[PDB]
Design a protein around this ligand. Structure first.
Ligand SMILES: *[C@@H]1O[C@H](CO)[C@@H](O[C@@H]2O[C@H](CO)[C@@H](O)[C@H](O)[C@H]2NC(C)=O)[C@H](O)[C@H]1NC(C)=O
Lengths: 26, 49
């Protein structure tokens, strides 16, 4: 799976659990 | 440079942190845009960079 907006007031927030914490639960 | 400013270049009013670019325009271009059709580079009209 492969993943200019910002200065229009739009922003992307991080998830609470990092990919390391999802891997530790798994 | 490296400072937030109110710029005008050739009538292009905008705001931003100016930085020395690594991009390389062909001689007839003066301006540059991102995927969103939004400005992301400009060429200095007096000291061509
Ligand atoms: C506009 O004129 C200035 C000179 O007033 C040009 O800048 C000069 O460029 C030469 C060549 O690089 C240098 O030897 C001079 O020392 C520069 N002087 C100054 C004051 O910048 C500038 O390049 C010109 N701009 C355009 C678009 O022609």
């Amino acid at each position: 799976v492969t993943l200019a907006q910002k200065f229009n007031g739009l922003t992307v927030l991080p998830p609470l659990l990092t990919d390391e914490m999802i891997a530790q639960y798994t | 440079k490296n400072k937030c400013v109110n710029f005008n270049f050739n009538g292009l009013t905008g705001t931003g942190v100016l930085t020395e670019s690594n991009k390389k325009f062909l001689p007839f271009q003066q301006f540059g845009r991102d995927i969103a059709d939004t400005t992301d580079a400009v060429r200095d009209p007096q000291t061509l960079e």
